[PDB]
From a paper:
Bacterial caseinolytic protease P subunit (ClpP) is important and vital for cell survival and infectivity.
The superimposition of both tetradecameric structures displays that the complex is slightly more extended than the apo SeClpP, and the Cα RMSD is 1.63 Å for 1451 atoms. In both cases, the monomers are composed of a common structure consisting of the following main parts: E-helix with a Gly-rich region, catalytic site, head domain, oligomerization sensor, and N-terminal loop. Figure 2c shows that the apo SeClpP has a more disordered Gly-rich region with an unstructured loop and two small antiparallel beta-strands formed by two subunits from opposing heptameric rings. A comparative analysis with the native SeClpP, the SeClpP-ixazomib complex, and SaClpP Y63A29 structures revealed that the Asn42 side chain in the complex, as well as in the mutant, is shifted to the “down” position (the hydroxyl group is approx. 5 Å distant from Tyr21).
Author numbering:
A (entry chain L): 4 to 6, 18 to 192
B (entry chain B): 4 to 9, 17 to 192
C (entry chain M), E (entry chain N), G (entry chain H), J (entry chain G), K (entry chain I): 4 to 7, 18 to 192
D (entry chain C): 4 to 7, 16 to 192
F (entry chain D): 3 to 6, 17 to 192
H (entry chain E), I (entry chain F): 4 to 8, 17 to 192
Write the structure that this text describes.
């Protein structure tokens, strides 16, 4: 990472690069970048590049809620792949400012997790992850215009979409052309 | 494991006298052996009692139900005798012996608790697993209710956490019929 | 972690502390030092503590908790992502009226976890100590939420997940911070 | 394990109603010892049985499977300590028929409180602590009955590892006689 | 570890030292050097030692202990979170009248731990050494707490957890620091 | 199993010969005790022969063998081949008086007991007192069986002390070097 | 390790060298370089070597030992916590009259440790070498304490723990440093 | 390991007074070999015994248990090297009855000094060194007696690994004859 | 490994003077093969023995224990390669009685120079190098005698892995006949 | 593995050999010995070789194959479950007209697998060898199925799964054994 | 490693290079670079190479050796602690009359170590190469000590430990550096 690295130079121009799995460390850093950019200028757009296989749903919601909280628009730009929570964040960008490059891929599926121990503990974990899926699907419905029933069906298995398909689905607004 | 010459290992020698020893965790291999022994004893004599000693921390619920159903399926009464400890599916099998012929020795310990499991993967896979283990707990509790005389609701409450019982407490609960005194 | 100052050090300049990890003695040492430094800079201005944490060490969390209550500035707490176990205890520890969660943040409360090994009398000592620790946590959660101790005991017996709105109803936070 | 029809040496001794407890006690060992006790009773409910004990102890519940079977069966079970009887091993030594509990002169006996573990939620640690304390009370009460010592004395004497010579074990009431050459 | 100086170096500028880890030779070397440095800068002004520690090496602790007693400034000790074993020994070693704990901080005292392996005579040497080390710890604790050596022996036979208020009654601290 | 299943050791046991050729642990001690009891049951008057090639091992396991030897009626000859070290040399010295042997190039080693202790100071104290008492017990018996003073045994066992067969006879650990 | 310079660098400005670890080649390299640097800055002013060390490599220790005797400044030695094995050898190596221990610091002396593997003639070479090294260590210790080599041999056969007062009586240090 | 009707192949050969050493020498192997030698003398104290040796060597004390038993018993023990006899294996080859030590033509013999290890305090390393040096003196003295070579030549010739052909072992005096087809 | 009534299958073949070498060659395998050869000679010193070989080779010294025993005993030993005979395996294949060395048509033969290792001081590496070089000369000389190929040719043909069909092994002189159906 | 013999031994009495595992030298040695024994018992009666095998060593497979072709009795081959790689080669090697599969048995053919490591010239030798081995396998498969060598080469470039009916149609077996 | 520059950089300013580790390609690269830099700064003034090293790679040692001989400044060598194997070779390589050891430093000489695995011919190549390397080392050692090659061969057959005074008498150094 070349140098005050290349990411800090892009941050000076209100660009945040997500290029990894989403965990609490990544979310803490991105949230802090978003807050800092709003403090610098509450009006100018922010640009969030997303190449991510997804990761923690709660870490992803830290980023998601910060995006919706701050005053500047956050443009989202998918490069390479936005899968799982990554495609949720892609769809979370400012309306009209969600993009994917022509060969970028988008994948949606249901959340993953685990449960171990007593029957009642497994029941609690199952209820929690099912409620988490409902929350994701409700928001994806609002952000895409698709019905919750259709999102439920379309995420039962791994669902790969081209950029053109992601646009038609309502996950992005435009395929960014050269 | 000593040998007895009339050449039997000690467990085979006791099987000759219609005694089956359960002294390990319950898995499919152990259940396969126990079931085969029960079927063999029935084939030998369908009237004489069988004696099942139980010192077991429990284990696989489905393997325990292979044993449970075989006990109920065969014609001879299967006396159960707890020595040391009968916990989880082990206490379930202890309570499954022929009515009036379920025993524990005075310092044997009985422990009841809800079944354990796990689930990994997609939310809908976790839901299927949760629904399955919950249905399995209902099945266990319903049978325990029948065999002890306790209501299902009391069993649910009394198995939420590990519940250790003395032999005397096990008799009062209905899990055994008598403490076998010296 | 980009440079502007690394990003966290830049936010600290504006009296913002980020808790975004498991709570251990190292994290608590750092958070406590930041709180003391900010009080030294200005004893009157608010401090903002963002919390995204699965929890962790009870004693480390109480190092942070007691420092929050000790210092003069109000400490606002803001849950983003998840505040679980000791993290949710710290969320509820913010200045009354200044405890927040964002709309999709999750809150989870549950009894403390631990272990005990050795002689019977050593297991007894360890059990008494963790039981006392839970009573201590529940007493404070009762005063900070308005709920009875009996209700907190019962509601923490197993993992209990709360939405942001449920956390407000419960008294763990004061407001869901809307966009 | 040499052979002596063919017997291993332990099977040969079992023909003379001798059982050798020469290892840590777990469920596998207890299962074998119990089966040997039941077999010998089935062969002859009158004749004494001889239980040699060289054991560091082990599982308390497995030890009680052995303990209760000894008390259940009709024959007297003599106990003979060689080398070491520690923890649950010393509990079983004291469990022999009264008047027929022995140690050889240099055998070592050790008594101490039970050991265990617990992990997880506070309430789970509470349940495990209550269970091991009740197990200790059960062990101390029986040891009081078999030794003549008060439960309060047994409690104080098992708080830490307590090593006894054979002659001290006799004075304590854990055995009846030191078998002198 | 945020930057302002890193946060700990910034606190050191105000004569605050943070012990927030297990005690070992490296930690003691750092703490001793900070104490000698602070005395060199000003031999009259108080030093503040925050303690959140599970304890650790007895000899490393005594490097710290003897340096506190050696230097001219008073060293205040402030327990946050937990001071256990050699950590609670150092808490009680602060200047008399200037030993503190925050209300929910926990203090634990117990006898030293160690090991030995090899020949009978090697084990005997190691046993005699740790027993003498325990006598030394107990004698000093007795002096610093006002409790008899026999009571300290009894009270440290097993893990002994104390609240901050109990630590004050015991004589391990002078006051519970209230908000 | 080595050659015939009825192995070579079982064939030697028919002739009242017990072959110790390993470290001494509870399994080995239980086997040897059982063999000794068996041989006494077969004939309480005929000698037993115990060959010893052992680096030593568990002190309590060794005392199970030692006390059984003293308990039974038959004389137990001891014959050192290769090495009898630590508790192996203790058992070598415990054979019937006048019937303790070593072959000419066999080696004997004596030293103090080994052990460990971990935990609280008072737990280490208990463990140290126990191993010190075990050493006094070993030295007292070795004094009785060799004729050497307890103080000399203490000195001579402070460190590993290797002895030739002839030196072990001079020391009193054996009665005769068995020459061809 | 806080910044002021790191804390050790800051103490080095005042001619203080902190030994707070095992002695190996890397540690010896650093301490020798610090000694040479301090001589080059001022050949007259005393140097201060603090020692909390469990010992370590004999040859690395002699790199430090010989450099102390080589340079012109006096090197005071101050034991804090523990000086064991080669650590106690270095403590005894300070300028005569300027060897100190703090009151609860401990000192341990014993013979060197090592290993040998391979052919009989290789084990013989290794045995002769460690025996000659012990003779070298005991001879120098005899000169530095005033004790006979026979007494030092007897007193290092096994681990031999000494209090600070005992180390003064032994001649390993000159004074116990009281507060 | 095949069976001959029931003997395993080695037990079948032992019936004909043949003992096969085909492994490293440790206490277990020595226990077996010593027991076989004692057994064969008990059957017949006059007829020769045949010890085939293919061994890389191993424990010196285990080798001396075998060595001393060979010299103790009345029957002659012929030794026959096949494959390799190295270190303590070549010591045992040379220990066979005079005139009855053999190697097949392509068997190898290797002699060298004993190997060992030592850890701990200087005085413990000294004790370990003195013991292995004394052991080497014992081995060389006996090899001198059995080969006819001086002790000083044995010392020189075993300082490093020294490989000999069958014919060279005969000229050296380690064996009496190369057994030709 | 199935049983025939009671023989395991290998023991049943041994009854018919058939030895199966079906694994890597080490001291344990050579100990068993040698014992079987000696046993069969004792049963009948005139009747042929049949040694099947499916082996990747292995220890050169273990292989020479088998080799020399084959040449020492009176019966002819026929050798029959099935599957593969590589390295010391192909050396033993060529060691069969002249005219009675066979391979089945799809069996594979591979010859190559010996493998080993050396570690330590320069003079120790030199000793190990000299020894493995002398071993290679020994192997090459015997292979020259048994195949009719010059030593120079065997040297160059074994510098690297050299794979031979059964037909090529016959032309090379490693076997006498390809055993056709 | 039950008794009555073990179950495989009881079937061998009836001239049935079960191959139900990977083909390695141990398996091949046993199967070759079983074939030779059965020929010695009766040189005229058929032998039955059941095959459920994922393949294995090519040379081990050829020990079996050559022994099948060498002995006088016919060897029927019967595929149950799966015959893959060297397993399908042995299936095709049965006596002509006496090679079978059960209706849901699967057959798989592909090219041999191997590895090579070292100098360029060593890699070249290993490549030439495995390429020659494939030519041998294909030539025999061509003879035993009636397919051209070119077709066999094409059809084994990748894993090629075949139903029992496709295997019969291919020439690898003669009949699908129907219930 | 304290700051002043780390301590080694501070000494390099005064033309001092410290070797205090095993010799590998990484250490040799750094030392060679320092030697070349120092010559470029000043081709006339002496360079001082301190050596405490157990040795290591022969080729890496020759990288240093040849660079010492190549550059114009005299390189003094000073053994502290131990110089063994290639370390003692480099000690003996210093400028004539400027090779030193401190009084208790030890010097060890022995033959090179290595290994070889694979075909007979590969083992032969490796043996020939290490024997040649030993001849190369012994030839240069003979030139630099004045001892004959045959004596060096004898004296390096096994590990040979020398005191500083013995190393001077041998010709490996010129002077024992006294205080």
């Amino acid at each position: 990472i070349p140098t005050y690295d290349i990411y800090s130079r892009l941050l000076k121009d209100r660009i945040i690069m997500l290029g990894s799995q989403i965990d609490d460390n990544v979310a803490n850093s991105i949230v802090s970048q978003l807050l800092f950019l709003q403090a610098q200028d509450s009006e100018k757009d922010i640009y969030l590049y997303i190449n991510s296989p997804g990761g923690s749903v709660t870490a992803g919601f830290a980023i998601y809620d910060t995006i919706q909280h701050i005053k500047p628009d956050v443009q989202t730009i998918c490069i390479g792949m936005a899968a799982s929570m990554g495609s949720f964040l892609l769809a979370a960008g400012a309306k009209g400012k969600r993009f994917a490059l022509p060969n970028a891929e988008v994948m949606i599926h249901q959340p993953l997790g685990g449960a171990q121990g007593q029957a009642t503990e497994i029941e609690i974990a199952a209820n929690h992850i099912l409620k988490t899926r409902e929350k994701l699907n409700r928001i994806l419905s609002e952000r895409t215009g698709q019905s919750i029933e259709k999102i439920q069906q379309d995420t039962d298995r791994d669902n790969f979409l081209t950029a053109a398909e992601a646009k038609e689905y309502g996950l992005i607004d435009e395929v960014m052309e050269p």
